Symmetry: C2
Subunit: 167 residues, 2 copies
């Protein structure tokens, strides 16, 4: 095991993402953050919080609970608003093959009809297996196929960190 991002690195990446979201989406007016995977949901909440303290406007947060690693399956969803004709940004903790994002994207296209969907990820470890790319990245991390990258957030786990494992 090895730590690649610590709490400070994660906080800086998130502050950078929040700003980029605000800069490229007209202050995030009418944009919905939708987290996928457990930690993606927590990151979406952190981003909404950061954006609100800057915009003075709350940002709607939704979620899709999916079995992560095209086997990943959408067991449900919970988006407090109608997303029809709204810009949605999926928030993922670690972008890898892209297969969870595809399952999450399919669900959104069937829960509502958003005008568009973007992708923000804390870490992109490469090795996609689908033509899906992140629009916002906290940190690109070069990995081999056998490595595993894992994010720990303090509202779920013990600490805020990103670790990489061999095997």
């Amino acid at each position: 095991k090895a730590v690649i991002l610590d709490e400070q690195a994660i906080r800086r990446a998130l502050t950078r993402i929040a700003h980029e979201m605000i800069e490229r989406n007209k202050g995030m007016n009418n944009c919905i953050l939708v987290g996928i995977k457990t930690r993606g949901i927590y990151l979406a909440k952190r981003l909404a919080e950061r954006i609100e303290q800057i915009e003075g406007n709350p940002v709607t947060v939704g979620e899709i609970d999916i079995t992560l690693y095209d086997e990943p399956l959408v067991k449900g969803a919970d988006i407090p608003v109608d997303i029809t004709d709204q810009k949605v940004i999926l928030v993922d903790d670690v972008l890898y093959t892209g297969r969870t994002v595809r399952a999450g994207m399919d669900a959104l296209v069937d829960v509502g009809r958003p005008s568009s969907i973007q992708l923000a990820v804390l870490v992109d470890r490469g090795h996609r297996e689908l033509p899906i790319r992140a629009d916002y990245i906290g940190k690109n991390i070069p990995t081999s196929k056998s490595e595993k990258v894992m994010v720990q957030l303090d509202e779920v786990d013990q600490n805020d960190l990103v670790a990489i494992y061999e095997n």
Copy 2:
């Protein structure tokens, strides 16, 4: 109406794509080209032909006939081989919103279970509405939202050309 690419421009872009496919996919050994949309199917056949005349090995071509967005409904596929564990490359004529590619991608993850899916497009006009990007592009063409870009191939139309229309 205005012509942005002529027969020669189309031919050069395709030769460039065929080479990139060969260079990035070990000579295209075991890679399947799958066309989407009428002209995507024809371009896939042209690329398979170019790759064969360079590699001396045939390239399997498949197809998904979906209608271009304005969600795109899949009428069905037709892939002469079992694509399970095989690298697939979708071939599109014009990449725009990405919504036809999404419908085509979903199908592929149901007819078979390819190890990966990449995307080759003759023209990318921008304005995606999904986090889908092309891995091979013949020509990037900057457009406004109201413009329409259309590919014409001689197998189905009068000439080989790409035109742009205002609205």
